């Protein structure tokens, strides 16, 4: 399944991942089910471990296109994990007291502690993808972020924290059924906005800002995982794999 | 929910709830895990409804003696609960900058915002705990923190936060059971500490503490509910159908943009 | 100077309170001035024991109308004071975050701590005020808030904080003549805003929100005193004098 | 001026500098007196307008050995400068909260906002200092935070910080005579801790380690200035004309609303 980490070559390309590629499970969504709730079990086993022996600090981030399945991965992929251990930080439009400070001063703040689970549902990614595509600061100031991010990541990793970046991959189709979609549920409508239409006007725009932010961040400390995310029992089934994985590497143990 | 439900009369007695009572449940151990399951396929649906219409807040005050099943209520009652809408503040021995600070200050830090669901494992009513059962503060100090508090919740519910506060209720030869049990598990022993033996020899003061924070602090705005809970089964079941009940009197709607 | 402190009998009527009076100083500005540096040296003192002795909190709330001198008073009252045990909180306009909680979260996290002074320039007040005066919630909701105020403070002082509020009480054409005094100076005109001819229109139904708030909230553990601002000299001199008097009451020791 | 200013070419050496040395100033303890009361009305303007324009945000840090000014120059230089500018964040022992998270997470949170100006007594080099000196940390880990420091600062620094670091200097003599003196001050013995004396005991290892975080840390955006402190007219009047010439540099302009 290491097709999906992208090597920190500096020379990935957004489009040799197809988001419609299941290749790595040898099944369809019945099986796959199967499968997630024994990674799942697994999953809550060394969430488990990972409280109890409070040593690592855990740092998943996702980032996707509007629909690309963020809300939906948090709450398959963690369900059943003990909530006193897994923390979500959701990072929306800055306010004007986190514009006041370096855009990384909020996200530094939701990092998580020894013995936490931590997801950034959105994260500082964010100041290299929206900030670069409409233009809120010149290229000259978003390009330096790269480094930025590079290092903060490097601190971050260095000190104990093992971070997981998962990028969640949608087609363009597929994100105009899923936006129709939430627009036809009167129990999804809500998380419809006008804005949501601009942002989908600038696909193109985003793809390129994903393809530069990853390519120029991926690192053996601070991977990227490309999950084609058209198939959400998939993209569920491979993420979990990816973190169970990478938990069980850290081979953990309760305390004496 | 009438009978646990603390009434807002100041002549709350905790020798009327029994640890041992499943009074309110018929069916017993299995009929109650699949009333549990129900309750908590429910309970998933009013947090996806909390966070959707992000307006009410919710607070849980999670109190208990130690063993009490403040962990396990958690995990239990909250199981596929959305993290994305559900938070855990513990509140453990304060540090150097939180009482540097009034007692209120770390807790009020912490509270639920817009759409969200927050449980306190423990919360602001140790502070008319510990002190009082060990005498640390004078009266004259603990005593004025009930009115602190009863204000606090007030200014809380006034705006917005729904408030259910627990005490789940064990019994002493139950906790003596749990500890030993907690000490004889490779996989839970890392939770015990020496000084929870030094809090069971002053057992019937915290016993005492607890009725008189209940009793002064029981409002119609943020009610104390009395959780019999030395059946395990029995205090998800009854934690879970207040929730449930509570969440569905705010008759929350989803938006239509 | 006890005709300032208003008396918790919830009697209190603005309209007794002249902006010009200067009463309880007899020589003018000249002797005030130089009654003012004496009491400024006394309080660079009290502040140098507060933080050695490391005990008592002490918070100062500064309430005034735009241009009623809480940005001079800080300035002037404070001249000397050391910046490590001195802090201004700030409240304006509040965010996303600091809605998404109650009104008195964000004031909550910033009372003073042991051993440190805390000026709120603004404060929870301005939930009883702006709100109250432009209807941003009905009245229902922000007069409840009272009981609130008066509450959150009893417990701040049965708690260690020593609680002074100043209402900086300037007349209209006061507040007019420093307007455009701010407008035609090219080092002030930065403070001025559109929104502030908005709040000027509004002039009688801030007194009476005023009015009402010192009347609902002026305590024993926590009094409000009504400063004839119209005076910058005689402003600077009564606020130093019931600071000083007040630290000085508290008998603080350096330790042993 | 500039001899104070380490060069970003990695060969610092802390032997070149004197505490004892004044020669930057014409003059002694009274001309630098009225000299100081010029910069620091100076330093007073320059704040006023940092907090009017709003766009850029200033942090001061301050570090030296126990008694070596930290607290004093904080008083002086910042003497009259207005409180709703100006922050001090003071760096302690850590919390077991704080040492939850990596070191820079406490430090972070402090930063200056725009139009701030904030004063760090100690800072995030206590984490190559201290924990270099009682070895809290391997090597190991420890010398991999210099890279982490220079990127931090370079981050801080590219999003509009101005970044200024004084190393206030004092001699192992001068160390002796000033906690003495703590020790015999009714005012000031508060301040003393017995800790102090093994810190001292240690006066060595902690100059090596002071020169190692200069050496690898003073960059073009984030320089550090040695400070000649066993003088407290001449550290104070030199870290007032360094920061006073700093924020001169910025050309700062008093917005003007349309």
Same mark, same amino acid.
């Given at each position: ?8 070559? !500096?020379?990935? &390309? ?12 040898? !099944? ?22 990972? $409280?109890? &022996? ?25 369900? !059943? ?21 370096? $855009? /990384? ?15 950034? *549902? ?12 409409? *233009? ?16 903060? &990541? ?9 971070? /997981? ?19 036809? *549920? ?11 239409? &601009? ?30 995310? *058209? ?26």
């Amino acid at each position: 399944m290491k097709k999906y980490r992208v090597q920190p070559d !500096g020379r990935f &390309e957004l489009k040799r991942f197809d988001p419609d590629d299941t290749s790595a499970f040898e !099944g369809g969504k019945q099986a796959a089910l199967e499968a997630l709730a024994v990674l799942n079990r697994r999953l809550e086993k060394l969430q488990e471990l990972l $409280y109890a &022996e409070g040593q690592h600090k855990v740092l998943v981030v996702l980032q996707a296109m509007d629909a690309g399945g963020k809300d939906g991965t948090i709450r398959v992929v963690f369900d !059943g994990v003990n909530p006193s251990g897994v923390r979500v930080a959701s990072f929306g439009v800055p306010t004007e007291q986190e514009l006041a400070r370096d $855009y /990384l001063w909020r996200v530094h703040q939701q990092v998580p502690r020894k013995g936490e689970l931590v997801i950034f *549902n959105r994260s500082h990614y964010e100041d290299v993808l929206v900030v670069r595509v409409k *233009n809120l600061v010149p290229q000259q100031v978003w390009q330096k972020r790269y480094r930025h991010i590079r290092e903060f &990541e490097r601190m971050l990793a260095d000190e104990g924290t093992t971070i /997981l970046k998962f990028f969640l991959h949608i087609s363009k189709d597929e994100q105009r059924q899923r936006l129709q979609e939430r627009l036809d *549920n009167p129990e999804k409508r809500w998380k419809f906005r006008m804005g949501d239409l &601009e942002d989908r006007r600038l696909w193109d725009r985003y793809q390129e800002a994903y393809e530069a932010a990853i390519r120029e961040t991926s690192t053996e400390y601070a991977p990227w995982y490309v999950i084609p995310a *058209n198939k959400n029992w998939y993209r569920n089934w491979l993420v979990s794999h990816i973190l169970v994985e990478t938990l069980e590497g850290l081979a953990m143990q309760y305390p004496q």
